[PDB]
Structure 1
């Protein structure tokens, strides 16, 4: 299903007439420009490759210059593919635009983004590990992992053991979000809930796959 590429602009609230306050995220959607269409005879799968935003000409390589010039679009700051079906490819064509009116108020969507990076983190923050007693004779180990295995059988650490490591900065999808408003003059989506990432980060909005 074809989606949009926008930018997390920030969070707000929307008051309903009945007094309910709704936490919302504003996604700014520069209208996406179709750069390529992949079909079964050429690529082995059907997809719509789209670009959005703008990139100055000195940061655009010659390869990408020619790739955007083949289509009738200007270079954007990123290029993304959406895997689609036929009959979801009727009025789509290279050099076309996919705007914010692809979504309706109340439609359920999934938002994909890059979560905030927390760097190197320990078991407590990364795996919800429990701390050991702060003061009952406890030595210099309060937030440490504890045991990492067993004795001589198996005599190793198993794969997938939860240890300290880099946390966040991953691709995350939040499903089941509702479209609170579709401002086509501001080119903005307003969705209910929280979406992954920081303000200014790239987010992909798709129709919900749960259906």
Structure 2
């Protein structure tokens, strides 16, 4: 399994031998198990967890009853983690960042920062055409988008301008620099997706 945390921000750890390790600080508060999915009822094995602390007015009656069944406080959302062959968890169990104590590398999933409507230069690394040498109104425009009568259409997946970022991104195989269970902190080497404050899903590295 993994845990749900919050991107606090970035800093550095100076090592004794004079290396500065860039770190993303992830606040990993206790993940409370809200539901355990099994093969008989649900057709797959997973835990649903919550974290943080939502305010009663913002918790709907459907949400409240789900948390109340688990016997846990409402957190700011629900996330599932698929269970391994061995792994067992109970409803209402709290899972801390101590989970990651012996984990060397993590995959961190977040929602990337939103660039809104992005041109092909930004979105797809298209080359600009001539700034001068006669170019007419076509500096950052995409150029040709197809062939001719054959095929007489634009192909699906054509790289064009559109919404960029504000989407799920996983960065794989980030070194765990420090697990500070007392401060509810995980320090990972390097950048992770999303703005300060955003939800992060941290899992042990799939690749190894």
Asked if Structure 1 and Structure 2 have the same fold, meaning a TM-score greater than 0.5 normalized by the shorter chain, the answer is yes
2:150 to 153, 168, 178: 153
- Cα distance in 1 for partners of 2:191, 2:65 equals 38
Query: Is 2:180 the counterpart of 1:183?
Result: yes
- Cα distance in 2 for partners of 1:67, 1:176 equals 34
**Cα RMSD over matched residues?**
0.9
Q: Tell me the SS of whatever aligns to 1:125.
A: helix
Asked whether the 8 Å contact 1:131–1:142 carries over to 2, the reply is: yes
Q: Which residue of 1 is the match for residue 56 of structure 2?
A: 57
Kindly state the Cα deviation for residue 107 of structure 1 after the two structures are TM-superposed: 1.1
- Cα distance in 2 for partners of 1:104, 1:68 equals 28
- Cα distance in 2 for partners of 1:118, 1:105 equals 36
Q: What TM-score comes out, normalization by structure 1 length?
A: 0.97
Asked whether the 8 Å contact 2:110–2:192 carries over to 1, the reply is: yes
Q: Which residue of 1 is the match for residue 140 of structure 2?
A: 143
Q: Tell me the SS of whatever aligns to 1:203.
A: strand
1:94 to 77, 91, 96: 91
Q: Tell me the SS of whatever aligns to 1:174.
A: strand
Kindly state the Cα deviation for residue 104 of structure 1 after the two structures are TM-superposed: 2.2
Query: Is 2:141 the counterpart of 1:108?
Result: no
Asked whether the 8 Å contact 2:97–2:179 carries over to 1, the reply is: yes
Q: Tell me the SS of whatever aligns to 1:64.
A: helix
Query: Is 2:206 the counterpart of 1:209?
Result: yes
Q: Structure 2: state its 5+ residue gaps.
A: none
Q: Deviations over 1:121-152 (max 9, x none)?
A: 11100000000000101111100010011111
Q: Tell me the SS of whatever aligns to 1:185.
A: coil
Q: Tell me the SS of whatever aligns to 1:179.
A: strand
Query: Is 2:75 the counterpart of 1:76?
Result: yes
Structure 1 stretches of 4+ moved >6 Å: none
Asked whether the 8 Å contact 2:103–2:204 carries over to 1, the reply is: no
Q: Which residue of 1 is the match for residue 13 of structure 2?
A: 14
From the superposition, tell whether residues 48 and 70 of structure 1 become closer, same or farther in structure 2 (CA, over 3 Å): same
- Cα distance in 1 for partners of 2:2, 2:37 equals 16
Q: Deviations over 1:141-190 (max 9, x none)?
A: 10001001111111111111000000001100000101100111111000
Q: Structure 1: state its 5+ residue gaps.
A: none
Aligned pairs, how many?
Answer: 208
